[PDB]
Amino acid sequence: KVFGRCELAAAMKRHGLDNYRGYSLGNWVCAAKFESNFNTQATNRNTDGSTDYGILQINSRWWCNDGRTPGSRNLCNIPCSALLSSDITASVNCAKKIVSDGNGMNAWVAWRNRCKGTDVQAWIRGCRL
Ligand code: NA
Ligand SMILES: [Ru+3]
């Protein structure tokens, strides 16, 4: 599923991501924009053989099981395919674990490089929330 900007904002809010660990909703929308272009089915293979999955490009090295990332963990206790669903629940639940793990949203390199320090409220501006 490819979300609209305000549509994703609303779904993230419903699932408790707004201000989660102090990160306002626009941070999460900005991160999803640059990680996946709002596409739940996005996947990208990393140089190390791990893969990033879903709207927030969660990595199989640590967070989900895809069966083809040796030595990896599955800290969200989910198949990586669950992160590709039209329903964002699994991605949100796992993102909550990630952002709680010490480095906040810096875990998402696109957030650090393209969202951090910017006017992230612009991502939810105009949306009925
Ligand atoms: Na894994
Ligand atoms: Ru804009």
Cross-strand bridge partners of residue 51? 45
CATH number, domain containing residue 127: 1.10.530.10
Residue with tokens 């969202």: 115
Active site residue 35: yes
What is the number of domains present in the chain?
1
Residues of the domain holding 39: 1-129
Name the experiment that determined this structure: X-ray
CA distances from 61 to 11, 14, 83 (A): 27, 28, 14
Of the residues 7, 18, 52, 119, which is catalytic?
52
66 is in an annotated binding site: no
Resolution (A): 1.2
Measured in Å, residue 12 CA sits from the centre of ligand 2 at: 18
Of the residues 7, 18, 35, 48, which is catalytic?
35
Backbone angles phi, psi at 73, to 5 degrees: -110, 170
Buried b (16+ CB within 10 A) or exposed e, 55-86: bbbbbbbbbbbbeebeebeeebebbbebbbee
